[PDB]
Design a protein around this ligand. Structure first.
Ligand code: HEM
Length: 291
């Protein structure tokens, strides 16, 4: 199936900047969530999980149809906790009922990254809601207890190469693992609602110990109180991933640029943009607008 981007009728960059801004203002306001981490990280994860169901082989799943709104997908065990991001976005969608669900979930992620001081992420509109029976089955999102070979093979289905995978994984600077959610517990670093390359620095520089958490799963823990999942740690066990980790640990701008590309790509897999579609939008942050 071909999913052609269809611009919400009559809308242009200013309409979407207003949605951006409403997301960004609520991110600022609703600051208590998750022990004052705020909603930035879970909105980034929502954007990723709503996009990451894509299968390049048959164009099932992906961000286009906004299918997270249907119970099979919102109740995917892999999506445990993302209901908080959805509930955050609900008043946004009520204010701007014209935006499609896929456009709102993906824009939430863009807005979160940028408001967290991350790179600009160009963003295109035009996702169109598709019906309940187009919701992908559970099981397309990745397991965390696996090795580098798993990670590499997993991400081939999303058409991501080694650099794209290592760049995307840098989003694990953000937020934390929650035991009751994923069976893993702890943050990956200190700056977990500011977008930086800390994930790579911590991978290389902390003294990691392989421990079992209280759900009886193994994770890597440091004396600083940080953790890494087995799939995170695989990025320094595999020598190809390791080289790239070192690159991003040593060049924040390169990480920003490569993350931006990979994240836009993730959010756009599966979508065909007509030749005469609008160019991608680059939204101004609240700070840049003086708001
Ligand atoms: C091999 C791939 C990946 C695996 C196995 C994985 C696994 C996990 C797990 C287990 C959690 C913790 C969930 C919880 O307990 O709340 C998590 C959190 C998170 N992941 Fe991933 N992840 C992967 C890739 C990504 C990518 C590609 C992104 C986005 C670019 C991403 C963004 C996030 C964010 C932002 C959080 C924190 C959520 C929060 O604080 O609520 N992850 N991930």
């Amino acid at each position: 199936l071909v999913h052609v981007a269809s611009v919400e009728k009559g809308r242009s960059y200013e309409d979407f900047q207003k949605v951006y801004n409403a997301i960004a203002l609520k991110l600022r306001e609703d600051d208590e969530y998750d022990n004052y981490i705020g909603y930035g990280p879970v909105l980034v994860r929502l954007a990723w999980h709503t996009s990451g169901t894509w299968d390049k082989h048959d164009n099932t799943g992906g961000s286009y149809g906004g299918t997270y709104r249907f119970k099979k997908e919102f109740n995917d065990p892999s999506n445990a906790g993302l209901q908080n991001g959805f509930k955050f976005l609900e008043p946004i969608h009520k204010e701007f009922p014209w935006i499609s669900s896929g456009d709102l979930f993906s824009l939430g992620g863009v807005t979160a990254v940028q408001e967290m001081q991350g790179p600009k992420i160009p963003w295109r509109c035009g996702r169109v809601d598709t019906p309940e029976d187009t919701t992908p089955d559970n099981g397309r999102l990745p397991d965390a207890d696996k090795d580098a070979d798993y990670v590499r093979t997993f991400f081939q289905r999303l058409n991501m190469n080694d650099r794209e995978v290592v760049a995307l994984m840098g989003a694990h600077a953000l937020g934390k693992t929650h035991l009751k959610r994923s069976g893993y517990e702890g943050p990956w670093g200190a700056a977990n609602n500011v977008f930086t390359n800390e994930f790579y620095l911590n991978l290389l520089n902390e003294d990691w110990k392989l421990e079992k958490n209280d759900a009886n799963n193994e994770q890597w823990d440091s004396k600083s109180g940080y953790m890494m999942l087995p799939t995170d740690y695989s990025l320094i066990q595999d020598p190809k991933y390791l080289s790239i980790v070192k690159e991003y640990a040593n060049d924040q701008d390169k990480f920003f640029k490569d993350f931006s590309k990979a994240f836009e790509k993730l959010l756009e897999n599966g979508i065909t943009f007509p030749k005469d579609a609008p160019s991608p939008f680059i939204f101004k942050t609240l700070e840049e607008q003086g708001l």
